[PDB]
Amino acid sequence: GPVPSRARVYTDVNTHRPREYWDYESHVVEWGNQDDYQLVRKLGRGKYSEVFEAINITNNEKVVVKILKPVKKKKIKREIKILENLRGGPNIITLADIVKDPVSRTPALVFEHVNNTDFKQLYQTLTDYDIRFYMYEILKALDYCHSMGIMHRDVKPHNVMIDHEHRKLRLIDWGLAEFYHPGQEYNVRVASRYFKGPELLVDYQMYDYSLDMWSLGCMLASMIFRKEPFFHGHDNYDQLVRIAKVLGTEDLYDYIDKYNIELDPRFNDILGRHSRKRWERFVHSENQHLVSPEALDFLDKLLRYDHQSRLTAREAMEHPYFYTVVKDQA
Ligand SMILES: O=C(CCC(=O)NCCc1ccc(Cl)c(Cl)c1)/N=C/CCNc1nc2cc(C(=O)O)ccc2c2cnccc12
DSSP states (O other), X not given: OOOOOOOSSSTTTTTTSOHHHXXXXXXXXXXXXXXXXXXXXXXXXXXXEEEEEEEETTTOOEEEEEEEOSOOHHHHXXXXXXXXXXXXXXXXXXEEEEEEOTTTOOEEEEEEOOOOXXXXXXXXXXXXXXXXXXXXXXXXXXXHHHHTTEEOXXXXXXXXXXXXXXXXXXXXXXXXXXXXXXXXXXXXXXXXGGGOOHHHHTTOOOOOTHHHHHHHHHHHHHHHTTOSSSSOOSSHHHHHHHHHHHHOSHHHHHHHHHTTOOOOTTTHHHHOOOOOOOGGGGOOTTTGGGOOHHHHHHHHTTOOSSSTTSOOHHHHTTSGGGHHHHHHTO
């Protein structure tokens, strides 16, 4: 059997709270009425939801309405409770209302509107400073929700809204977020393939906040190297292969042995043997301007098989990669 694991920060925060903080199944919801919101236009279709720009008719404030696709009432109360618990935190999207369409009785969430920006020209005029500033802002959100006993489990660029005009960032879509409890075994069929931590890929269920830190490193690798996504896996098994060809296999089979993780028999004959690559082999003329020694050192310390040895969000925010960003904020 697999060796147990504990988060090495914020391990017990939820045990210390009243049970109603994390026992979301018994959370009572006060379902509002839509019609206070006229849908303006559709902003996106996800697997679990559709998102619309809408107008609150009472005061004309721009707003966003996420119409939840049929899931277990559990998953809805989870997202609501986590949103309610994180309300007011740095760079957490604000849940404004909880409504139900009066005829369909379908649940919907009403969020603050964010004037997010043309990521097309955003990715072109992206500076080394830009990437450091917004990475720091994400870490603010990550460190806060981890400190509140909450894993996001779906960190990825589509879930980061930037209002580049106002230098504002919001971490959104908390529908896969979970309360961390020491010793709990989680589903690994969460997040998007290209951002899954190896713990998800090898089926290690006793993971923790450090899962978000892996995804964040995937976002970081993808941007500084101008390669989206950075690990481009054909499927969930070929994803570990793509990681193995970069991080090497020696650390992989040590991670496996260290947690007595039983590996799938698909895996034996597809991983093979690979050396840990030096990051310089991903630098080239069209991305030098974003790569620095500090960037590479920070990236290396996020992309580790062992989740325990990844930096915490707080540790990350003290890395030399962010020294100038920290200065300007004072
Ligand atoms: O645009 C996007 C993707 C944006 C993007 O590529 N970023 C780049 C990542 C990045 C870039 C540079 C750097 Cl340097 C770094 Cl680090 C990261 N995704 C939005 C879809 C629908 N739009 C909305 N979706 C919501 C959902 C929820 C929810 O489900 O909770 C609540 C509220 C909203 C919402 C609120 N107001 C306006 C629009 C929306």
